[PDB]
Write an enzyme that holds these catalytic residues in place. Structure first.
Site, mmCIF file in Angstrom:
data_model
loop_
_atom_site.group_PDB
_atom_site.id
_atom_site.type_symbol
_atom_site.label_atom_id
_atom_site.label_comp_id
_atom_site.label_asym_id
_atom_site.label_seq_id
_atom_site.Cartn_x
_atom_site.Cartn_y
_atom_site.Cartn_z
ATOM 1 N N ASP A 188 13.183 29.148 -11.307
ATOM 2 C CA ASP A 188 12.580 30.055 -10.682
ATOM 3 C C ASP A 188 12.782 31.551 -10.846
ATOM 4 O OD1 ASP A 188 11.299 31.672 -8.597
ATOM 5 O OD2 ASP A 188 12.599 30.517 -7.118
ATOM 6 N N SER B 127 1.776 45.639 -15.854
ATOM 7 C CA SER B 127 0.760 45.510 -16.473
ATOM 8 C C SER B 127 -0.212 46.889 -16.768
ATOM 9 C CB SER B 127 -0.083 44.220 -15.924
ATOM 10 O OG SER B 127 -1.247 44.066 -16.705
HETATM 11 O O1 FLK Z 1 10.009 33.440 -3.650
HETATM 12 C C1 FLK Z 1 9.227 33.717 -4.608
HETATM 13 C C2 FLK Z 1 8.422 35.157 -4.616
HETATM 14 C C3 FLK Z 1 9.283 36.219 -4.511
HETATM 15 CL CL1 FLK Z 1 8.239 37.598 -4.051
HETATM 16 N N1 FLK Z 1 9.121 33.177 -5.647
HETATM 17 N N2 FLK Z 1 10.012 31.932 -6.031
HETATM 18 C C4 FLK Z 1 9.576 30.991 -5.021
HETATM 19 N N3 FLK Z 1 10.515 29.854 -5.447
HETATM 20 C C5 FLK Z 1 9.873 28.609 -4.532
HETATM 21 C C6 FLK Z 1 8.655 29.119 -4.265
HETATM 22 N N4 FLK Z 1 8.637 30.768 -4.371
#
Ligand code: FLK
Length: 330
Positions: A35, A199
């Site tokens: 992640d 971007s």
């Molecule tokens: O939590 C976020 C978004 C941050 Cl803005 N991404 N990571 C993640 N891991 C599990 C679901 N989401």
């Protein structure tokens, strides 16, 4: 040193990707969701509330001769999808694809939200954002990449996610056979703890490219692509019958549609997301309405280049003293 591990979609829709991680001595192999949008390495464990475990493989630190409780440390995290987990902390030896970090903080879950319980394929998460986001208290802990960085041949990792197919995460090197053309690098702001970049624009299908700066994060831990409402409206306007559904919670479209591609700018270069990548299947089994892979970031608070975007590219997370992001076609 270097490491290389295969990452596999957890289901037929590419809802997330799992990568095997070895923890402890002898090794306990858990399948973790890498992640780049968080900075905690946490695992289902022997400490997770029994009613909140449903098929996951657990980390049992009492069976690891290298595990050590990190006295007094706790952690608690919520993600962009509303899920959350919390617990205590051990240090142990962690290996990814041949690359080993001793004394890695392994955050052991005491509680997980229903979303994690219901997903029997994900044994935990391995955060790869910047360690300033790590939730361990009172002593903040470093990510796996942060801990490994000095030892790596080059201070980088790469994400090469597959569309309905396995892919690869590499640490410490760039596989020049894994992409076409050249890698375009773009500047990163670490100020929010994320791999945050800008971007240079977008196109819808064969349309003309619109130059416009879109600030967002490169996030392997988010499934879909979250962009500003103007951009997302322009995309779905090209799809007969597509509409934003308040009841469903996003843009949906007839499953009978063939979707247009979506191009996003990296500096002067372009990454093209094939239309099929944007189809996330029926909103419910048997439905003829399908959920869109491009959704509005309004109310999220940040634009998120999730797996829908990242899997169209070879992505270099460059952790040099001045971090940057690299994108190549593949
Ligand atoms: O939590 C976020 C978004 C941050 Cl803005 N991404 N990571 C993640 N891991 C599990 C679901 N989401």
């Amino acid at each position: 040193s270097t490491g290389s591990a295969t990452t596999t979609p957890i289901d037929s829709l590419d809802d997330a990707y799992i990568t095997p991680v070895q923890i402890g001595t002898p090794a306990q192999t858990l399948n973790l969701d890498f992640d780049t949008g968080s900075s905690d390495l946490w695992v289902f464990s022997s400490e997770t509330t029994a009613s909140e475990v449903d098929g996951q493989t657990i980390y049992t630190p009492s069976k690891s001769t290298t595990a050590k409780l990190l006295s007094g440390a706790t952690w608690s995290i919520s993600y962009g999808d509303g899920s959350s987990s919390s617990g205590d902390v051990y240090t142990d030896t962690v290996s990814v694809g041949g690359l080993t970090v001793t004394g890695q903080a392994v955050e052991s879950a005491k509680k997980v939200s229903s979303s994690f319980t219901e997903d029997s394929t994900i044994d935990g998460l391995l955060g790869l954002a910047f360690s300033t986001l790590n939730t361990v208290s009172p002593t903040q802990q470093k990510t796996f990449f942060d801990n490994a960085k000095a030892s790596l041949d080059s201070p980088v990792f790469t994400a090469d996610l597959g569309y309905h197919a396995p892919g690869t995460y590499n640490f410490g090197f760039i596989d020049t056979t894994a992409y076409t053309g050249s890698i375009t690098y773009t500047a990163v702001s670490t100020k929010q703890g994320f791999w945050e970049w800008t971007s240079t624009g977008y196109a819808v299908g064969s349309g003309t490219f619109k130059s416009t700066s879109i600030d967002g994060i490169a996030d392997t831990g988010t499934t879909l692509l979250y962009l500003p409402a103007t951009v997302v409206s322009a995309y779905w306007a090209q799809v007969s019958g597509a509409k934003s559904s308040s009841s469903v919670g996003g843009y949906v479209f007839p499953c009978s549609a063939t979707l247009p591609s979506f191009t996003f700018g990296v500096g002067s270069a372009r990454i093209v997301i094939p239309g099929d990548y944007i189809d996330f299947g029926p909103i419910s089994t048997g439905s003829s309405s399908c959920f869109g892979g491009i959704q509005s970031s309004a109310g999220i608070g940040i634009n998120i280049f999730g797996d829908v975007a990242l899997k169209a590219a070879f992505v270099v997370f460059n952790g040099a003293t001045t971090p940057t992001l690299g994108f190549a076609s593949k």
